Amino acid sequence: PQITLWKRPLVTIRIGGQLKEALLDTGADDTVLEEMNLPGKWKPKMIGGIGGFIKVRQYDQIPIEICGHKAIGTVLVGPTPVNIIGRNLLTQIGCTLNF
Amino acid sequence: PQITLWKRPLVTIRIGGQLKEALLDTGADDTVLEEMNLPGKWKPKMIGGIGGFIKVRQYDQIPIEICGHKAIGTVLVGPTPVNIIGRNLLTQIGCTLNF
Numbered sequence: 001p002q003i004t005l006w007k008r009p010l011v012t013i014r015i016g017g018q019l020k021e022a023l024l025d026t027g028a029d030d031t032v033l034e035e036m037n038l039p040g041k042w043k044p045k046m047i048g049g050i051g052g053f054i055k056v057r058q059y060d061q062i063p064i065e066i067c068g069h070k071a072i073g074t075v076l077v078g079p080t081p082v083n084i085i086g087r088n089l090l091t092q093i094g095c096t097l098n099f
Numbered sequence: 100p101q102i103t104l105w106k107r108p109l110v111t112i113r114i115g116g117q118l119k120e121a122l123l124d125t126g127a128d129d130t131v132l133e134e135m136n137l138p139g140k141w142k143p144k145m146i147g148g149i150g151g152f153i154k155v156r157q158y159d160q161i162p163i164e165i166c167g168h169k170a171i172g173t174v175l176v177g178p179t180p181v182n183i184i185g186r187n188l189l190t191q192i193g194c195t196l197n198f
């Protein structure tokens with residue numbers, strides 16, 4: 001597909017067995033999802049943005065489907081205001097910026 | 100160009116006659132640049148990111164050339180971790196996401 005940027009590039013993703021709306025975010029190195037009680041082992045991490053840092057839980061090798069395209073990789077879970085699909089998964093679903 | 104996302108999508112911009120490196124950030128509504136001087140009136144504004152809210156200076160109708168493509172629009176100056184080009188200017192240069 002082609003997604004214009006007149007509005008926030010929000011798409012439907014599936015992780016665990018929840019459907020969520022998430023931003024396709026070229027400015028995000030990593031994928032950061034809103035607080036959810038995901039099973040499995042995790043490691044603590046801090047990530048920084050506008051305003052400062054938040055504490056997140058890093059889970060590895062988590063399958064996520066992004067608009068019907070399969071991906072699997074690291075997801076960070078924490079008190080973000082929005083679900084963010086970062087470059088780690090965007091490359092996996094074949095996503096490019098074009099102008 | 101077509102820009103893949105295995106690396107951060109950093110580009111050279113020209114603003115106020117100066118060259119800077121900035122991040123094409125589809126997850127950003129607004130364009131936010133690190134502390135710098137720009138001419139003309141600005142107004143105090145606050146914006147929120149992943150880590151909380153910051154104070155910025157809002158400059159309106161500012162020319163910026165992004166990777167050779169002209170935009171003229173709102174630029175926010177403040178304590179962002181990195182220069183970010185957001186959707187207000189990405190739309191002007193005809194940037195879309197494609198997968």
Ligand SMILES: CC[C@H](C)CN(C[C@@H](O)[C@H](Cc1ccccc1)NC(=O)O[C@H]1CO[C@H]2OCC[C@H]21)S(=O)(=O)c1ccc2c(c1)OCO2
Nearest residue numbers: 027028029030047048049050126127128129147148149180
């Ligand atoms: C360091 C470069 C960016 C500022 C990083 N941010 C991704 C942004 O796309 C972020 C994504 C975002 C979007 C909404 C809320 C919070 C975060 N947008 C953002 O802060 O935009 C602000 C400017 O425009 C405004 O519109 C949206 C918020 C404002 S981030 O969310 O803090 C972020 C995401 C994944 C990360 C990360 C930081 O560090 C490692 O992995």
